[model samples]
Target chain A: KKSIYVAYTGGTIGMQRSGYIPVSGHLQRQLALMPEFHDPEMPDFTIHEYAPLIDSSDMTPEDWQHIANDIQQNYDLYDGFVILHGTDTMAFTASALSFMLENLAKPVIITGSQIPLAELRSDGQTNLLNALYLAANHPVNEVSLFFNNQLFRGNRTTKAHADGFDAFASPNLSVLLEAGNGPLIVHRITPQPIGVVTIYPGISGAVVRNFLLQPVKALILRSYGVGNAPQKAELLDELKNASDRGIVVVNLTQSISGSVNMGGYATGNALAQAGVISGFDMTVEAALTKLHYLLSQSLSPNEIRQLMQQNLRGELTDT
Target chain B: KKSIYVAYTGGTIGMQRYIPVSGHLQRQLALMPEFHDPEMPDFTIHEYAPLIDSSDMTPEDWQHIANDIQQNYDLYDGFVILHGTDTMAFTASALSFMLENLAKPVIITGSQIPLAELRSDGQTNLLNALYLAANHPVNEVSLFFNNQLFRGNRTTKAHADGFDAFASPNLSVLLEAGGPLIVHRITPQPIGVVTIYPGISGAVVRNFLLQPVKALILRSYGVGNAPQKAELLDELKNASDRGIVVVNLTQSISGSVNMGGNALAQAGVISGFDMTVEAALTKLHYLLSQSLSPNEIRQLMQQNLRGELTDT
Candidate 1:
């Protein structure tokens, strides 16, 4: 009989209402009562609940490191791993693990919900069941996320909807596979001091200058259309100064879906000439964590810049 | 012949290379023979002096635009706003609330490429706005982009580089036009938006809360969740206690913020369920500009004022 390892790493999935304060144990109690989880066709599973549950918003590079280590140590114990994570930074964890477990030969599926199991319209049971089944049977040997009947690449997904059950989307890439009737299947990285700045319609050059004034080792410029920013001299000069000072400046499109091609327009070219490298098609989660992973090592700024453009762990397309 | 009023606000649609030039957009449109075609509606251009990119627009600009529309309200059959795509939703959302009871189509639009570029989308985007304003009035503020019309307050910029740039994730499109029509469809105050990310410092939240502002929009995680950190919660709670309207919006592009007995609810963060940032921000501006108190504004932000948010 195939077996799976499920790490209940906290999220709305397992949260219980204690007055207005959220506590734990509701997930375990609810799972024990569910007949679907105990079905004959389902894989044998063990749930390892963390001592102190993590709020996804408080998740960091250190947390990602712990999750990676957990999977690595249990690599041979189970057929696959299903991480019950909070939706907020589940994308970050999946992306982090993908890079950490580079040549993994088993599936690692991360899944979560907007509501807990004990409540109405709770998507936890379905997400967990599908994630477990997919990992045990249709192993993709990749870090993937299962939600709303679709499986996506870990690094490619983003939490697109805040309230809807179909919360996650892989904007740049297509779904790996879909979960059909009585069936399902689907399916990481590091941490980086990198700062992210989303370019809006009326952002001033002074704001950009002040943001760069931070002691960040690298910066992610979420620029407009194909990586365009205002052609303001002060902004460009500041970015150039940051680049010259060996601070890695990467350009990511502010668009929900699109690649950054600096050669597409004059505004984009201005950023390129200012020494801002293209993040290409990587999402903010992937780009930021990837920066952490690279920066953590002894890689130089030039080396990090070069590697960022190259496809690493399928996190980015060949743009 | 019906006439439309066009306010040529700056964006990529009217750029001279990368910089916006005064009267440059009008001159470019004048050279385009399609604009002078007999089938088109008669339109008057009232360009802003020293055109600015949508990035430079402020609340004052929104008021000025609203005033302009109101000033010419009786003279025109319908109105078309030629704005930059960057903050077009902000302008659109502001106008939707500011316009009050409107009975004419006030279509706002812009292009991804300059009208003079090789593959510019300006002509179609503009021409459709005028055509729709004249022929198919929605009687409310709306956005016309990539052939889809969305309620102004409901729209958010989904793409930065693509011609199909805006989306109303929670709401359906009002109209879509190809062989037919698909449509759908929003701001600002001293209020600022603080997007929550993993490991966000309390200091940053503190800084935003400490600023002398009427409101702060907290873009929390899925379903209005934020880090339950003591420091973070304390900062938000203090802001709420001080009568600063702290509204909870989702960082996700879709869905509503139903706090449902979470720390945020205890912190007195108002649920801005399913509202795009543009809608929530402009809605705050609209409410703040009035003599309404913070509690009144807080209550109104959660309620459906203009179809910007779904009432749960």
Candidate 2:
């Protein structure tokens, strides 16, 4: 009997409303009444609960560290681990874990739902149960995100919808597994390392500020069509000032599908002169998150500049 | 008849092998013996030559500007303009124009291959020419790259290959025109006016050094997964001492997608700090081309920083 560890971090899946009224902890009581949890094929469950259950928006790096440490300490005790995380920062946490747990041998699956498990039309039953099944059966080792009947590499998944049954997807990368009528299909399992594992002592939220006074490393300059901007002397001066101060600014189009060019026209030329790098075909969220992660490292400005233009973790495509 | 301007830039479609043995350009010989240019149903064809013949590596910025300027200047003459923004910096050029050239109805269209006479394939040519048929078409503009067409307003076409028939694709936005097919997609367009219009005059390329400095923006650092080097730190300091400066930076992973984080033990923390990728790239390029030295670069590290970035 494969033992699966379920870390219930609190979300809509477990919430229950009193007579359909709005309240917290209502969904947990309803899970027992749901028919899906009693499935015979489902693996034996070992549940871990968070002390103060909260929404996804309240998730912090400390919570992520705690989660990683939990997995590291009890990795051998369970066949697989499932985390019930809030969907808001679920992608961020998933991506961080993909980097944190380098060569995972067992599945580290994160799952959540838009509706409570007790609800008749809820998506939690399939998402949670299937995630457990995949974790227990699949021989792959890596962090994964399961939602809307699809399983994807945790690093590649993103929440695309605010209120939809199918809420998550990895547009840049392919799905690792999918849940269908017959047996669930596992497409591919990425290779893992067999070397020593090093987990750092989490993040220190004090020295780090989310909103910076002067953003460093890479700045995603939201620009007009094809990444054009005003080419005035004053604007150039400001851009130059930022560059002189050791800031790395990259220009990305607000448009979803186009590339950022700096010398395509007079406007782009001005930006190029002002020292703006072009983020070609990168999602704003990916670009922003990638910059934050890279800037936190201790690399030379040149090395950082080169890496930004390269494809790291399938985030951005270079020209 | 509605006019559609087709700017003919030299590329693969224009070249023909001189002889069976040598695959070279035969200047005097005819590349295609049975070549015929197709006539559009309602639009008049105006052919314009590009200032510089572009290859796969030539910057797409020039092509983007050429198309934008042509559309902006001759918007009344035609409804759409087609030109290539591949090789050099096509995506960058497309993104730039997406922000700069707004309000006016201009569709920047280009092909993977040059439509040279007999040498040209008629299938895509017919589709592309017909695609630009309507005058006073959809007010919003975008690039028509690869087989999947996109609205100009919501288009940010990516180039995966130069000659792979199907290369460019729209990132997050999708468009349909005429019934369900004519659907216009909404994309995440930048708010506020982009400040890089008109022209840049004081661009001194000579002042920009190739070596002695580097800059990057870290994204996120939870368990020290980012790259850090002490020698790189020494180089940064030596460069600063000798008037060459570097920037180590960060931006919140949530707000800025291009930045990453580093560990507490990483040398970037001790040398300078974290920054956004955009901030680091633009800042370093701007400084390298200026009269500022390493010390000035270090001293100015915290000033204006610009709207390009926000320092934590």
Candidate 3:
């Protein structure tokens, strides 16, 4: 019997009106009633719910560490490990875990839902079931964010549409696998948790100045279309100041899709001149969290910046 | 005679290999065999005086291209823009605003591979752009790349090196290049984009409200939400109080913005429902450029103006 390891770490998936405090046994019994949990086609699984089942807004890197530890402890026991996480911080956790885990031999699929389970019209059931299927069956040994009907590289996805069923999207990267389509399109890609800063026309350097005040190692500068910041000396001067002081600033586009071509426009070119490196089409979510992973490693600041520009875990697409 | 107005702007599709003298994109497209090929429709060419890589395309370029279309409006049945891939979306989106009452197809296209290069997606993209611009009766600006035809404003260059580099995440493809050419037409609106983040303050929106602009397209988090602060909501409420529309849309590429979904999202933010940034921005420009008032334009933005949005 192929077995799957599960860590239900707080999200809308098991959340009833009382929040994500539903018991692991309750979820198991709920699924057990469905009559497919023990079949050979579906695979037998264990759900290990985390303490105090937190809402996504309350998710942290510490929680990510705990989940990673949970998966590492049971890595040798199961074919795959499925982590149920909150949507908001799920991508962060997925990305952080991808960095935390080394030499992964089995898939670490992270799945969740916008609509909670235990409700009649819920997306949580399908999303969880899909993750369970991919974890037990798919041989792609990497972290994935399985939701809606597609499996996205865990680190690459962002909760784009909250109210809609298609809650998560990897704007810069294609979905790793599409489940709703006729045949499963396994793109077979895997790949961060970090902060996000979006730019606007009226933005001044003051916002960046305040954002820089955080005790952070890296920064994701989500600038205008094609990665254009405000064409001003003060805005860039503040960025160059950050770079000089050893904070690795990655130029990410706020335009959802497209690379950080810092050489494309006068405004963007100015950013390149300011020593801010190109994120090269990475999402703000991926760029920031990826920095968190890179920083958590033994690499130097410069080496971390270099890795930020380079694709470590299929986080970037050069072609 | 079916004629297409050709504006052979500088792009990868029109590049040529000049033997050795610093081998830059030597503009010898007039001398191309395909330009004279019988399969293509009869078209006029107005190559720009100074060729620009899409990276250098500016607002001035927008004015020039639109004026050219207006100047030769009656001479051609449609228009084709042979642009560089880097900033073709900006051009198409800008044109969707500049060309008032656009009555014929203004199709924009380019290549991931240089036309003179070995693996060229240039010819197919160019030919299909020409085919639709010459034949179709669709009256809107559009971008055709990798066989997907997207509403110009809805499309964004999504990749660094993929052949299918552009996409319209919030909206559906207007038409696919290879098939029955199903067209999804859309109208335009003039809105300022305010891309929000986790730690953003009300300082920027304070400045955005001071402008004489018509609407604020708050590119909010999944559904509609800010930092869950009172000042942010009050700022938006203050703007709406001043007759400036403050609509919310998702910065998340694929979902609709729902201010009604949650308590935080319910904070005085008008939902864009599910409009793409390009559609919302272009539609705002289109409506504001007309003789309509703020009230009429605001109402129109919420509606399915030219199918730019899924009905909210």
Residue B178 accuracy (lDDT) in model 2:
30
lDDT of model 2, residue A316? 51
Candidate structures ordered by TM-score, highest first: 1, 3, 2
Sorted on lDDT, best first, the list reads: 1, 3, 2
What lDDT does candidate 2 reach at residue B133?
A: 37
RMSD in Å for all candidates: 6.2, 15.3, 7.8
TM-score comparison, 2 vs 3, better candidate: 3
Measured with C-alpha atoms, the lDDT of residue A293 in candidate 1 is: 73
Worst 10 residues of 3 chain A by lDDT: A183-192
TM-score of chain A of each: 0.90, 0.71, 0.87
| Candidates in order, interface RMSD in Å | 3.5, 19.0, 7.0
In the range B1-312, model 1's lDDT, one tens digit per residue, is 789999986677777788867788778878888887887889998888867677567676787788888888889999999887767887898889888778888999988788888767887898889888987889889999998999999988787667789988889999997711111111334555655666655655665555455677877777777877877899888988888899888767677777765788898788998898778877887887677888898899888977898866
lDDT of 2 by residue, A17-52 (tens): 553323444544555566666577667767777777
Model 1 chain B: which ten-residue window has the lowest total lDDT? B179-188
Q: What's model 1's overall lDDT?
A: 0.79
Error of 3 at A23 (Å): 9.6
> Which 10-residue window of candidate 2 chain B scores lowest in summed lDDT?
B197-206
